[PDB]
Scaffold this active site. Structure first.
Site, PDB file in Angstrom:
ATOM      1  N   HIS A  97      34.177  -1.748  43.882  1.00  0.00           N
ATOM      2  CA  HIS A  97      33.719  -2.232  42.849  1.00  0.00           C
ATOM      3  C   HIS A  97      32.779  -3.529  43.498  1.00  0.00           C
ATOM      4  CE1 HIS A  97      34.728  -5.830  39.921  1.00  0.00           C
ATOM      5  NE2 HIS A  97      33.944  -4.956  39.417  1.00  0.00           N
ATOM      6  N   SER A  98      31.818  -3.652  42.678  1.00  0.00           N
ATOM      7  CA  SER A  98      30.818  -4.935  42.933  1.00  0.00           C
ATOM      8  C   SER A  98      30.657  -4.993  44.216  1.00  0.00           C
ATOM      9  CB  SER A  98      31.687  -6.118  42.297  1.00  0.00           C
ATOM     10  OG  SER A  98      30.393  -7.185  41.996  1.00  0.00           O
ATOM     11  N   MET A  99      30.934  -5.991  44.861  1.00  0.00           N
ATOM     12  CA  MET A  99      30.489  -6.293  46.342  1.00  0.00           C
ATOM     13  C   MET A  99      31.042  -5.024  47.270  1.00  0.00           C
ATOM     14  SD  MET A  99      31.466  -9.327  48.961  1.00  0.00           S
ATOM     15  CE  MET A  99      33.140  -8.934  49.043  1.00  0.00           C
TER      16      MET A  99
END
Lengths: 282, 285, 285, 285
Positions: A97-99
């Site tokens: 998720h994301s980073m």
């Protein structure tokens, strides 16, 4: 055993274990300043997967790095590989998720022999910087290191106020998401709780990847990719990103919800799980 | 009556060693050495430069400076931060850099990133780092990650005779005089069971996870705003590289070529004097 | 051809500094200094002891040796372990100790605990530590715990002028000569913004959580198995505590009464020579 | 809202793990486990002590707490300082201690040293450490120093099967229920290549350099000012020994012998209930 501490040569990391030990091996990587509870709704819905939900260095219950060490994207990537080593995992999947998705993409492009598939939630490439601004960006990073010692740590006399502070934070996320994150993200201090973090996580990188760098990484991915994009996330909102994604083979699914759609409520978690359960069955 | 010549400099994240040369009131200069060398690189040149207060610094993991903590990297801009924190700990707002080989490359990065802090650059046989383009960057990150995974606790070479430790350093890099090797050995050897070892950190052999692109290197050199005096060794590689000459003709830097190898400022008193003549005149104005 | 005089000694848990004296093939001796001093304590004495290979060690948190890692203690047995590990890292199975003040105390503890390793003891104006009996022990532990909680708030003085740093050392602790304080300052000062600070670890001010009782100390002294040469300064230890004189009379140590203060070996060349004459004859046997 | 059950507690020198039990407004108690155990030692017991806010702490080197830095010791009074710093970090000035075995010994040291801070002691099958007299102290320091040298060559055992590690817990010192072993193993095992390993720090096997003497230990137990509830296992060495029985009749501590082994509060729910009863009453008075 569902909560373990994993000892690497240079650091100790925390991880929460989901699913059956015979399951398909997955390391789940969370977003900047979050922790493994980012997957508390989603991981239990992915049957057949052995999911190691890792706290990145300086996050959740994992150790802060030693003095002088950096929090660059490829430091996280090294840590993940060394986690795989401690588990005996030669080929494994990444759920990010994301980073965490950005780190997963770097790993898959650098070491395609290790990564079996990528399940990514609203993240793909990092913010980039070109060579013309690089001397200036390094000066900014050096000056921020000098100023680091004088860096703020907020305190909250009471739980829901710390929760509320997170709801208004980097992005918008539900009260339940913030509560779920807080259970792994808060540490007691004299006069209440603070969000456990490492001041270095706010430091700017001394050297950003150039656009060409980021493009060569996505182009170097050799395994299947499933990318969930949030309609109210700014990833799907950026037009440059839509253009880039059309040039790539990655499987795209747009889903209603915010950046943290897998965590905000059971409906988002269930929607995301549908896509990925099918992905992993193939 | 007696003056302080050898010190520890305490930074927030690491403690470094330094030798101090010149008058406390001299022009402030930090001298930075080459890869796997130490501050004795300046043992003949720094004394010849009067009027300069020279802090000849051991880089992390070299000479008598501490090794970095576990998990930390030895990237060029890590040295750059260490140098800047040294200047802070010394109370220096503006200062000059004297750099040999890798130390020159670090000086350029600092000057181009923080032009308000660097007064001038005196560079010896070094300017820009080896570069790597974006199309190879995935492959280089994987090689970097693989080397990290493979790095091991191994007994570095042990030499029972000091003479033999000195000789091993002559076989190394390019050509270096016996006198230079001996000077470096005085600060570069540690005792181990049965003799001496060249003190080093195994992580110094690791490749970078992310090289500067040719465009990054050009932008840093073209961002240097302060006066620069660059000395090239006539029997080194830079003075013979035509890409290097073409680059220099586009830059405002002063250039001088002198006889000797890559360590010409250390090999003998003559080369030390030859470099001192160039730097003394540059710093005089 | 040049010889190695200054080195880093790598132990598993800490890196220490040492100055090397004498021929590489001389009798092995580790020289240990006083509390808040450094290896320059032996700058006058060690060169006068021919035929001894002397490793003048900086204790942890002193001179140029590293500070201990976070949470580690500076208890007398902590120094003893360090010295034992220094001998291991040098390849020394059996060795002698030359100790001044606190360093003499550490030497006795080591000689008493591991008599198999210690060939001879040369002691300068030190023997046993301050002791504490069991009846004050809970109080002393409470006081040590309280000091540990209050330690965050410690800071070190800054001397704008080097002379002022020296004079601060003449007033501090016992009386030592200006030359002694200068010699120690060469290895004991670090640069800070606007001047110098005596390099030190604030933990060195903490009180012990568990003092040795009088019976502990006397058992350690009684447990020494090797020949011992003790030098007693007329204005040092015995002038401070005449109760020692009766203890010394029950011990088989060789005793030499000499003029001067607690730092008689460093204060002037007259003391250095007289101590050297005593130790040079002792080491020959 | 959901509640915070597992936390890190950041001290200046180390970061510990803890599990939080009970109403956030309850009686402040820190619970301390035994040597090589972890906070699961209180998994059955703490849920049954209503009205108490119990911080079940992993000692340094145990469970999920960090290991100490290089060179730092694991002595009784190091644990005691950590416990004090945990209280400070929690903003607790006065608090109670619930300790098992080693944890109870630490609690007694704390109460004896800082009586103004400790409200109540609830002790399970521990009171004072093994002691040692001054005449044995040189030899004991020698053994500790030698063990420090030998610790190098040790490697922790690796169990390919979960179960061999669990039932490896049952063997050796102590008799303990399988449920006890598995509960401790939930927080004390870590995955490694080849199987699992017990997370405890190898330095925890080192002998102390300096034991408390009998006199020290008596002075601590006799310095405890607060109310004490001590539970003794009838199936444990502490209850049976006559010298111990004699000491306890001289001490103003509430005493209860209960059937069960050394880990009686953890072996089974019945034993936990029994200890809960005694303590629940003790904390209500």
């Amino acid at each position: 055993v569902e909560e373990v501490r994993i000892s690497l040569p240079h650091i100790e990391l925390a991880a929460h274990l989901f699913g059956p030990p015979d399951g398909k091996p997955v390391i789940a990587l969370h977003g900047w300043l979050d922790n493994a509870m980012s997957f508390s709704r989603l991981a239990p819905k992915l049957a057949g997967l052995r999911i190691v939900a890792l706290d990145f260095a300086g996050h959740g219950h994992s150790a802060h790095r030693a003095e002088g060490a950096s929090y660059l994207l490829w430091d996280y990537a090294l840590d993940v590989l060394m986690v795989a080593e401690q588990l005996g995992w030669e080929r494994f999947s990444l759920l990010g998720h994301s980073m965490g998705a950005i780190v997963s993409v770097l790993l898959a492009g650098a070491l395609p022999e290790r990564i079996e598939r990528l399940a990514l939630i609203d993240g793909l490439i990092p913010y980039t910087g070109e060579a013309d601004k690089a001397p200036q960006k390094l000066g900014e990073a050096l000056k921020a290191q000098l100023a680091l010692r004088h860096k703020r740590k907020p305190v909250y006399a009471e739980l829901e106020k710390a929760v509320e502070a997170r709801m208004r934070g980097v992005g918008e996320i539900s009260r339940e998401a913030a509560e779920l994150l807080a259970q792994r993200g808060l540490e007691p201090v004299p006069g209440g709780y603070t969000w456990r973090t490492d001041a270095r996580l706010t430091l700017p990188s001394p050297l950003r990847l150039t656009q060409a760098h980021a493009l060569n990484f996505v182009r170097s991915v050799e395994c299947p990719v499933s990318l969930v994009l949030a309609e109210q996330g700014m990833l799907a909102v950026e037009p440059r990103m839509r253009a880039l994604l059309e040039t790539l083979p990655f499987e795209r699914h747009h889903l209603p919800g915010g950046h943290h759609l897998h965590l905000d409520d059971e409906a988002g978690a269930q929607a995301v799980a549908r896509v990925f359960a099918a992905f992993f069955a193939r």
